[PDB]
Design a protein around this ligand. Structure first.
Ligand SMILES: CC(C)CCC[C@@H](C)[C@H]1CC[C@H]2[C@@H]3CC=C4C[C@@H](OC(=O)CCC(=O)O)CC[C@]4(C)[C@H]3CC[C@]12C
Ligand SMILES: CC(C)CCC[C@@H](C)[C@H]1CC[C@H]2[C@@H]3CC=C4C[C@@H](OC(=O)CCC(=O)O)CC[C@]4(C)[C@H]3CC[C@]12C
Ligand SMILES: CC(C)CCC[C@@H](C)[C@H]1CC[C@H]2[C@@H]3CC=C4C[C@@H](OC(=O)CCC(=O)O)CC[C@]4(C)[C@H]3CC[C@]12C
Ligand SMILES: CC(C)CCC[C@@H](C)[C@H]1CC[C@H]2[C@@H]3CC=C4C[C@@H](OC(=O)CCC(=O)O)CC[C@]4(C)[C@H]3CC[C@]12C
Ligand SMILES: CC(C)CCC[C@@H](C)[C@H]1CC[C@H]2[C@@H]3CC[C@@H]4C[C@@H](O)CC[C@]4(C)[C@H]3CC[C@]12C
Ligand SMILES: CC(C)CCC[C@@H](C)[C@H]1CC[C@H]2[C@@H]3CC[C@@H]4C[C@@H](O)CC[C@]4(C)[C@H]3CC[C@]12C
Ligand SMILES: CC(C)CCC[C@@H](C)[C@H]1CC[C@H]2[C@@H]3CC[C@@H]4C[C@@H](O)CC[C@]4(C)[C@H]3CC[C@]12C
Ligand SMILES: CC(C)CCC[C@@H](C)[C@H]1CC[C@H]2[C@@H]3CC[C@@H]4C[C@@H](O)CC[C@]4(C)[C@H]3CC[C@]12C
Lengths: 354, 354
């Protein structure tokens, strides 16, 4: 049997798998009579069950990496406690999801590395199924003692979405840094006990742009992953830029050239850092070392801030009136958990450079 | 200067170019105060002007293929008369668009082939700009004597969108066939002078599936283009399948197992034909020849039918109540002009096989 056809036929299966999801999601976004949320939960439940069964059949037949695995396991633990909370609240979906999570963690830990290397068409259909089950659970995620459950679900939400992003992915000077690490926590605490976030972010992004530009002046999977994760922040930034300029057209002190500069600096920071990292992969070596140090000790600060819930973007009245509550909320729900992945990738890459 | 960075930096530019569009489109879909349609028209007008200027600078510095060029030129002629009608109705956009169309046609005809071969960073930024200007004009297209203008704009609409698809692309037995060619016109005329369309399509897709399957039993850019264009019909089909099943849950004779079979056959037909074509690229040779003949003389029939305006899908009350008028309309607006590209590609490929 020619094996190229398996790549094509499986690929067609995979895209039909995604497109069926889109159809059921579209019929749900419309909030029409015939399609209810339970139909989407049933659908994906059926896809997880199919996956589990595939893994069981595989086990029957068989009669950098450290950072990736650590991130995967910790995200899995958070996505599993997310289900412990859902199950505690009361349906069926959180149980199949918990089983799926446990399965994925185990398979990725022990087999995806080299066991799968020797393969034919069974694995080619299995992997595509897993990729489009995860990449469709991220869709469902993004779309979707009462205060105890609400608080825990809030804090765990970006980690469940990031979990799905991370699994999708796999299946398919120094003094300023050290001060910044303490400042991140200080900003978080004072926020919990708005404008400080934007001022901190602008100052931090300007310093990062200067550092990375200096490093460039002194001078394929990683580049693609950096760009793929960068798109979340780029979308969020351009939404803020469009709303800020549109309001700036009329008489309004809303923007105060602080949300526009912030958004443009975020775009510039990412566009420069991606090149610095890609290029990195006698007296000048020390400054390059200081650049690598100051940069990842800064990356961590901007990764802790959204990770611990200080995110003020959901409370912005400008881009909610401009884009709509559900649209702006969804855009933030996409950009935030992907940004939490990008920053860790950046830290690990800069560390390995150093 | 290292040239790899140009690929990365230009790529970042290109995706930011797309994301800015998305932001302005999102602020427009919301139909909020600050963003009007004129801001989107101004935006893209600015991008075309930039492109034109790029081409002028390029000309200053310089001090299968037949089917592709023919399709491009005829689509350009239809997209240009589209502007002749818009200009006749009265702003600025149709004039810049006409200039853009004339530019593209000329550049693609004489230079894109080999003149650009010798290049550095100017061309790398130029091509990405052109790709994301066209691939964003397709977005605007899809979203958007009065009866004379309405009639002409209706008939020319799929050809303007297909024009943008085609340009995006480039920048980045026998007796049954002969009868089918006459039947396509007969069906078109009787439709203009509904159920016949669905019965014809079901009969035709079942015959195509049998032919292609038989050919497979007897036994990289083209495969990717076939899949990329197939996704339009796959989305449209899964929308019909989801709405049909959801209605089938309740007591309803709407589906009548004619829209569900049609949609599933369309998916199967495409999934089998894509493999037949990819595999194709003593006594059994004659049947294979008959298969190639019967198939492209059938492909043409299903390409003439939507091309000449017999498309009844816009009048479906089921998938408009199920998905919403604007959503179902948009889905058809995507699937139809892409399907018109797929079928021509299929005919040209089968012809070359024969
Ligand atoms: C890298 C490749 C394999 C995937 C590319 C990312 C996808 C996961 C993205 C691409 C476009 C996205 C889709 C864009 C638009 C919509 C429409 C949206 O429907 C709406 O609610 C709009 C208004 C309405 O219809 O109510 C629901 C999510 C969905 C299907 C999307 C979910 C995420 C998708 C599939
Ligand atoms: C990588 C490149 C080449 C692809 C670029 C595609 C992105 C620009 C897409 C992918 C995900 C999309 C988003 C995914 C889903 C939605 C859902 C939609 O929200 C709704 O569900 C409708 C509101 C309601 O619930 O009524 C608004 C559009 C938005 C934010 C989409 C906007 C466009 C995005 C960012
Ligand atoms: C092959 C690569 C380079 C591109 C992939 C195809 C894109 C051209 C597609 C992918 C997802 C699509 C987007 C999906 C979702 C939306 C949301 C949509 O906004 C809505 O109207 C939803 C509800 C609302 O917000 O009112 C407008 C079109 C847009 C931006 C899309 C336009 C076409 C996009 C960018
Ligand atoms: C190639 C693979 C890996 C990517 C799959 C992405 C598709 C599933 C995306 C690309 C284009 C998207 C469509 C582009 C734009 C819209 C606009 C949106 O319509 C609106 O503008 C909102 C209605 C209003 O105007 O109020 C509804 C979703 C829809 C049909 C999107 C549904 C999801 C689609 C088909
Ligand atoms: C990885 C895991 C083993 C340890 C850390 C992950 C955290 C996200 C988890 C671990 C246990 C969780 C806590 C237990 C229950 C709590 C209810 C209420 O009072 C506010 C949130 C509340 C205090 C939770 C916040 C998030 C926590 C702290
Ligand atoms: C690798 C990475 C994915 C791990 C992330 C772990 C964090 C999400 C965990 C670690 C410890 C947790 C905190 C401890 C208890 C806290 C008190 C109460 O107000 C609820 C939030 C509260 C402040 C928690 C927020 C989430 C934290 C910060
Ligand atoms: C390529 C081009 C040179 C020739 C064919 C392309 C067609 C899509 C174009 C050519 C001229 C166009 C016609 C001229 C004006 C007409 C107004 C009204 O009575 C109904 C539509 C109306 C009759 C148009 C239909 C579409 C036509 C027929
Ligand atoms: C290569 C490909 C992109 C070329 C497509 C050309 C067609 C769109 C053109 C060719 C001739 C045109 C027809 C001639 C006049 C017609 C009478 C009136 O009722 C308006 C529609 C009317 C029936 C036209 C529909 C569009 C046609 C069929």
């Amino acid at each position: 049997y020619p094996q190229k056809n398996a790549e094509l036929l499986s690929a067609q299966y995979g895209t039909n798998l995604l497109l069926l999801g889109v159809s059921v999601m579209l019929a749900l976004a419309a909030q029409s009579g015939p399609v209810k949320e339970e139909h989407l939960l049933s659908f994906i439940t059926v896809l997880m069950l199919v996956q589990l069964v595939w893994m069981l059949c595989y086990m029957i037949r068989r009669e950098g990496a450290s950072w990736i695995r650590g991130g995967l396991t910790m995200l899995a633990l958070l996505s599993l406690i997310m289900d412990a909370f859902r199950i505690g609240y009361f349906g069926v979906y959180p149980i199949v999801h918990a089983l799926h999570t446990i399965s994925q963690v185990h398979f990725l830990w022990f087999h995806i590395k080299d066991v799968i290397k020797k393969y034919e068409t069974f694995e080619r259909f299995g992997v595509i199924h897993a990729v489009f089950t995860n990449l469709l659970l991220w869709c469902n995620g993004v779309m979707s003692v009462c205060s105890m459950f609400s608080t825990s679900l809030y804090y765990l939400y970006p980690f469940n979405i990031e979990y799905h992003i991370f699994v999708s992915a796999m299946l398919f000077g120094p003094l300023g840094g050290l001060v910044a690490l303490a400042s991140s926590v200080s900003v978080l605490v004072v926020y919990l006990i708005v404008s400080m976030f934007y001022y901190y972010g602008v100052a931090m992004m300007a310093c990062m742009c200067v550092g990375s530009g200096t490093g460039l002046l002194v001078y394929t999977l990683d580049t693609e992953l950096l760009l793929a994760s960068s798109l979340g922040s780029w979308l969020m930034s351009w939404c803020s830029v469009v709303a800020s300029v549109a309001e700036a057209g009329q008489k309004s002190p809303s923007f105060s050239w602080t949300s526009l500069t912030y958004s443009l600096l975020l775009v510039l920071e990412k566009c420069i850092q991606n090149l610095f990292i890609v290029e990195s992969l006698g007296r000048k070596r020390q400054i390059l070392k200081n650049i690598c140090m100051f940069l990842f000790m800064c990356n961590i600060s901007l990764w802790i801030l959204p990770a611990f819930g200080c995110r003020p973007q959901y409370d912005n009245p400008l881009e909610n009136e401009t884009f709509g509550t559900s649209v702006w909320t969804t855009v933030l729900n996409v950009a935030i958990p992907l940004n939490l992945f990008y920053r860790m990738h950046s830290v690990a890459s800069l560390f390995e450079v150093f």
